[PDB]
Amino acid sequence: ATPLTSLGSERAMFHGKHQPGITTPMQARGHLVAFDLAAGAGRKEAAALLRRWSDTARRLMAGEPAGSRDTDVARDAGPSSLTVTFGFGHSFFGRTGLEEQRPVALDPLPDFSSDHLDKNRSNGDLWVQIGADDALVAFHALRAIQRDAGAAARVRWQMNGFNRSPGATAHPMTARNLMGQVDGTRNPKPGEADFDRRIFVPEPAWMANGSYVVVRRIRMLLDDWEELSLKAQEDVIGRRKSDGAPLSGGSGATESTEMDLEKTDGSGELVVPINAHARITRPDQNGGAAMVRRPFSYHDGFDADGVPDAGLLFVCWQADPLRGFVPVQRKLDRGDALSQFIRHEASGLFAVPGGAAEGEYVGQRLLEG
Amino acid sequence: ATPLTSLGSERAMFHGKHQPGITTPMQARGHLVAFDLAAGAGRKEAAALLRRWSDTARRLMAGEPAGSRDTDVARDAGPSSLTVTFGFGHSFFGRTGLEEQRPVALDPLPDFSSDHLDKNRSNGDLWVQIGADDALVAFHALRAIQRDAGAAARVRWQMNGFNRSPGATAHPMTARNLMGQVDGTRNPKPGEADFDRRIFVPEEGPAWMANGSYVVVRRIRMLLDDWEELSLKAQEDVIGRRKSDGAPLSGGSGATESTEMDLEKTDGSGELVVPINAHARITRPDQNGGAAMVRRPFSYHDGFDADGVPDAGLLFVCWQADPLRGFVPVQRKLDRGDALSQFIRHEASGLFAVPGGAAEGEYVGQRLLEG
Ligand code: HEM
Ligand code: HEM
């Protein structure tokens, strides 16, 4: 049986073809942070920053302290599956005089009618995703990365997230979200023949083996959601809450059982409703549009009226946003049974390049003089 | 070897002599919440509420769903060491016509000169502590307790915290805080002859508090921007113990966290090796006429402000039989006398009476609240 100490001893690779934090297994603790380059900081300052950040990432992902003046916060813990991932926003390129290298894929997301975005908690020059299965390890990484910014960049926004911890269930299982739904079942899987083309830029050149991430802070309107009946909730998604099986599934069905989108009930109504979330998001309903969803849940407290600031830190990965998040979200905007129960309140789109080779730093091909 | 699945299968007792969440081992996820009774709510409404809350705690601590309309957020997870703990604030008693039953131990904390308390994030009629080693299990419990309040109470304030996870280290060890210090070494330990008298109201102040304890909660921001500019020597002088292993500064290279602190040892210049204002010197029971407490905190980080200052620190939670023989005299001294005071800010506070555990067939606080 897998030992408890494996929570701490497990580690992800920093160096490799792809950056960690994309196909890396879900982590119990997450920090998303965006930085803006400081006044007077340009391409040279950005290059030095990414070099510092990569060195910090390399050390901490191996469970080692920072190079100098380590805080000891993560001392005695193993790497705990820590990953650090770096991305570049549209604005980064104007700030560094690198507009020639700005991918078309970074063109601004649509202004969807259902958007309620806080501009101050959205976008940014630089994005860092930190995740681990230990909270001190995760915070230690966040603080080290943030302190590495120094005079070169400032924290624009920062969000905390969480997921199920390793060992919480008797067997490895798909995660749940705060709506109580099984969440993550139908992601494209490594090993599928079209996975690389769906998710990664093929081998501008600086983005080779990279991916595009869309981040959305989506508040769940739990006060309304939880007033619904179980049947009503399951109709919104088109899958059962108990096990994640399609509503069209029999008693032996599981989350992986194929949808039957034609099956009707006693009343002649579609068993998986025509507006069900897990119907209308499918690649086969969106001209092949696909993405890898790798989110965190969040809860940041209650307001004066007792409304929870809680939901999903939606994070999705694709080779081209126009072949992933964007067409799907265009459809969900007004067509999704789920839309009235959620609010998109922050947004980001970042170019996440390939992994660092040994002796190199993340984004080196882009930033090197 | 302990299996990874033990994180989820481990469970704490709800029913018992003492409430869970006091001597329970440290948990990876914490939610602290205070409620104020609604307009018109009195003893009857409070009794019904604690009755609901107790049923909720009982089910969830055994890894069961809520009695009705469960959200499925905790489905498939084990209990994950979930505990739910209930306390009563000074203000509760005026609201319920139970002033005769208000413990003297709930008398308002002093207004310390170093206090920077947000009144809207302090105190309250009722306090709930929720902890677990899984975050969905922890949130599920928070939401269930909060929804149980209904027409009886509103959320006054709510704070989130975290600690090291089980399995993070190779062997079980004392926790660390966000200043990087070993934190918890010299806590009174169950089994010590004087532990019960230090921490719990005896089985036979008011009778309804039998086997209970008094909790002081402080949201203490750590001034990490200033703290992390110090040399290691300066940081270790503030506490009086090493960061690497938690040993007293008076210890040699063979010393460990269990090595006795030498309060008399001086250097070549005649100054104390463990400084006279060192935190881990001046907080000791032997430096405070026997004042003692069990510290069982969570760390917190709630983001950064516009200037990049982290809203991060310690959700300080301490347990004692009498605050005047615990938190109060110690903080009276730390206020201006502690080398650590310069690097922290007390930004919220609470003092709550936490009664004995619910017996089977009973709810928490029943002796106080029953008609
Ligand atoms: C708080 C907001 C959301 C919640 C609670 C949610 C929940 C779910 C659930 C329960 C499923 C079914 C299980 C699974 O296959 O993972 C699902 C599937 C899916 N969702 Fe969402 N989702 C949210 C937002 C979004 C958004 C904004 C997008 C894209 C614009 C999206 C894209 C997808 C995709 C592509 C699938 C898989 C469909 C398939 O191929 O079967 N989701 N989601
Ligand atoms: C952010 C604020 C604080 C930090 C970082 C902190 C840190 C520490 C550290 C590193 C130790 C030594 C290791 C140990 O035995 O646990 C310690 C011990 C202790 N602290 Fe604090 N502490 C804080 C607040 C407080 C407050 C507000 C009180 C009481 C009013 C307090 C009371 C004590 C006591 C009684 C001990 C053990 C003393 C002994 O050795 O017998 N602490 N603390």
Side-chain angles (χ1 to χ4, degrees):
Chain A
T2 306
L4 180 59
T5 54
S6 73
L7 185 147
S9 61
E10 278 291 301
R11 66 182 267 183
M13 293 298 103
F14 173 68
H15 294 300
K17 184 183 175 180
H18 306 299
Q19 282 197 70
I22 303 178
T23 57
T24 305
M26 177 192 79
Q27 293 144 322
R29 179 58 147 169
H31 300 291
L32 306 188
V33 55
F35 291 85
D36 284 331
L37 290 170
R43 180 187 176 168
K44 188 184 141 172
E45 290 73 23
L49 174 58
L50 270 278
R51 187 167 167 57
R52 294 200 293 282
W53 274 353
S54 295
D55 175 77
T56 290
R58 183 187 57 76
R59 292 166 186 271
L60 279 52
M61 285 183 61
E64 306 183 350
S68 109
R69 300 264 226 138
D70 190 80
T71 62
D72 284 315
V73 169
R75 187 170 192 142
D76 305 316
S80 303
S81 291
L82 173 71
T83 64
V84 187
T85 314
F86 305 99
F88 301 85
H90 184 283
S91 57
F92 175 84
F93 297 84
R95 299 289 316 274
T96 52
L98 287 167
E99 299 92 333
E100 306 292 301
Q101 299 302 328
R102 189 184 65 229
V104 170
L106 288 186
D107 282 350
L109 297 175
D111 289 321
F112 302 102
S113 75
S114 64
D115 273 4
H116 305 285
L117 307 181
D118 180 345
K119 294 174 195 181
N120 298 315
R121 296 217 281 173
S122 299
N123 308 306
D125 296 334
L126 290 163
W127 178 75
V128 183
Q129 179 184 68
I130 294 163
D133 288 323
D134 180 81
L136 301 187
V137 171
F139 180 87
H140 173 259
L142 170 63
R143 181 62 168 174
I145 291 299
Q146 177 253 326
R147 291 278 279 184
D148 273 345
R154 65 176 299 269
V155 174
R156 177 183 177 79
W157 58 257
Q158 193 266 303
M159 297 174 194
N160 297 323
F162 57 85
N163 283 307
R164 171 179 297 155
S165 170
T169 60
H171 311 280
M173 287 180 72
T174 304
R176 291 181 181 269
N177 64 34
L178 301 188
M179 274 174 159
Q181 298 144 353
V182 175
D183 195 328
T185 301
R186 283 248 311 166
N187 272 324
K189 299 161 181 78
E192 295 182 334
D194 55 355
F195 180 86
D196 268 12
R197 284 177 292 98
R198 278 169 157 188
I199 308 307
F200 292 112
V201 177
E203 228 153 20
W206 71 270
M207 269 294 293
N209 302 322
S211 184
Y212 294 93
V213 64
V214 171
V215 175
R216 306 284 278 199
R217 179 185 181 85
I218 312 182
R219 179 152 68 88
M220 286 161 165
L221 301 182
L222 297 178
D223 287 352
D224 298 329
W225 174 248
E226 294 169 358
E227 294 298 321
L228 299 182
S229 71
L230 182 62
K231 171 150 203 308
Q233 290 190 345
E234 291 179 340
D235 276 348
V236 163
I237 294 303
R239 296 178 170 273
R240 303 198 294 245
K241 295 184 81 186
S242 61
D243 56 15
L247 292 187
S248 58
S251 35
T254 71
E255 71 184 310
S256 63
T257 299
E258 273 284 336
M259 279 270 181
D260 187 343
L261 297 185
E262 311 296 338
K263 193 181 177 178
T264 63
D265 60 18
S267 154
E269 304 282 337
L270 290 168
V271 176
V272 180
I274 201 71
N275 61 0
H277 185 79
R279 173 192 281 267
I280 70 179
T281 47
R282 298 167 56 95
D284 64 23
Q285 306 296 300
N286 292 278
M291 71 209 74
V292 165
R293 294 164 291 125
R294 189 180 177 279
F296 295 89
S297 290
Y298 74 88
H299 171 66
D300 290 316
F302 291 82
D303 68 18
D305 296 319
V307 177
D309 186 10
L312 189 69
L313 298 183
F314 177 93
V315 184
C316 73
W317 295 95
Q318 58 254 289
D320 175 5
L322 297 188
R323 298 178 168 270
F325 175 86
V326 173
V328 174
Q329 176 65 9
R330 286 188 182 284
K331 176 184 290 184
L332 302 190
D333 187 52
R334 295 185 83 179
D336 189 356
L338 180 67
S339 289
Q340 66 172 301
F341 302 107
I342 63 173
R343 285 180 51 99
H344 292 246
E345 295 181 350
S347 180
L349 168 60
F350 309 97
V352 175
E358 286 184 338
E360 298 192 337
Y361 64 91
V362 178
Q364 186 169 335
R365 297 170 282 169
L366 170 65
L367 295 168
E368 232 186 349
Chain B
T2 303
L4 182 61
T5 56
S6 74
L7 185 148
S9 65
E10 280 295 302
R11 66 183 267 180
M13 293 296 102
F14 172 68
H15 292 298
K17 185 184 177 181
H18 307 300
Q19 282 197 69
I22 306 177
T23 59
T24 307
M26 186 190 75
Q27 294 145 323
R29 291 284 295 170
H31 302 291
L32 306 187
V33 54
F35 293 84
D36 284 333
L37 289 170
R43 179 200 65 72
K44 186 181 142 173
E45 289 74 26
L49 175 60
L50 268 114
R51 190 178 279 135
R52 291 199 290 283
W53 273 352
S54 295
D55 174 73
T56 291
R58 186 188 59 75
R59 291 168 187 270
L60 296 210
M61 286 183 59
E64 308 190 352
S68 184
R69 299 267 225 138
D70 189 78
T71 64
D72 282 314
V73 167
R75 186 181 278 254
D76 304 318
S80 304
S81 291
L82 174 71
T83 64
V84 188
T85 315
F86 305 99
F88 300 85
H90 180 283
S91 56
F92 177 85
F93 296 83
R95 300 288 315 274
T96 52
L98 287 167
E99 300 93 335
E100 146 93 301
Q101 299 303 329
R102 192 185 66 228
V104 165
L106 288 186
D107 280 348
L109 294 173
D111 300 291
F112 304 105
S113 72
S114 64
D115 274 4
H116 303 282
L117 308 179
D118 183 342
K119 290 178 192 182
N120 297 316
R121 298 183 78 178
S122 297
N123 308 305
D125 297 330
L126 290 165
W127 177 76
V128 183
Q129 178 184 68
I130 296 161
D133 287 322
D134 179 83
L136 305 185
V137 170
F139 179 88
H140 172 260
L142 172 64
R143 179 61 166 176
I145 290 299
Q146 175 257 324
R147 292 278 279 182
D148 274 347
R154 63 174 296 268
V155 174
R156 178 184 178 79
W157 58 259
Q158 195 265 303
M159 297 175 194
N160 301 323
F162 54 84
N163 283 308
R164 171 180 297 159
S165 283
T169 59
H171 309 82
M173 286 177 151
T174 306
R176 292 179 180 269
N177 60 33
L178 302 186
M179 275 175 159
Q181 299 144 352
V182 178
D183 194 328
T185 298
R186 286 250 311 169
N187 268 322
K189 288 153 180 81
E192 291 183 331
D194 57 356
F195 178 90
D196 268 11
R197 82 173 177 198
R198 278 170 157 187
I199 309 309
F200 295 111
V201 177
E203 230 156 25
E204 26 203 15
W208 71 269
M209 270 297 294
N211 301 139
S213 186
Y214 294 91
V215 66
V216 173
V217 175
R218 307 287 279 202
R219 179 186 181 87
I220 311 180
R221 179 151 67 86
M222 286 166 164
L223 301 184
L224 298 177
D225 288 353
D226 294 326
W227 176 249
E228 296 171 359
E229 290 298 325
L230 300 182
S231 70
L232 180 62
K233 167 149 202 327
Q235 292 189 347
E236 292 182 340
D237 274 348
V238 159
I239 294 303
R241 296 180 169 274
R242 300 197 294 245
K243 294 183 79 185
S244 62
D245 57 13
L249 290 188
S250 57
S253 56
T256 64
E257 75 180 309
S258 65
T259 303
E260 291 282 79
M261 178 174 288
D262 187 342
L263 300 147
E264 323 301 335
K265 196 180 179 142
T266 62
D267 63 18
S269 300
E271 60 228 337
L272 291 171
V273 173
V274 175
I276 193 70
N277 58 350
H279 187 79
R281 174 190 284 272
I282 69 181
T283 48
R284 296 169 57 95
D286 63 22
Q287 304 298 303
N288 292 279
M293 70 207 75
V294 164
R295 293 163 291 124
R296 186 182 179 278
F298 295 88
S299 289
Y300 74 89
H301 170 68
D302 291 319
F304 294 85
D305 70 18
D307 293 318
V309 180
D311 188 10
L314 192 69
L315 298 183
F316 178 89
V317 184
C318 73
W319 296 95
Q320 59 251 287
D322 175 6
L324 298 188
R325 298 294 316 281
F327 176 85
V328 171
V330 178
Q331 178 64 7
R332 177 89 69 183
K333 176 183 291 182
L334 301 189
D335 184 43
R336 299 171 88 260
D338 190 357
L340 180 67
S341 289
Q342 167 177 8
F343 303 104
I344 64 175
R345 290 295 182 263
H346 291 249
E347 293 182 350
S349 179
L351 168 59
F352 309 99
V354 172
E360 289 185 350
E362 294 192 333
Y363 63 86
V364 179
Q366 185 167 334
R367 285 301 93 51
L368 172 65
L369 300 168
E370 60 190 352

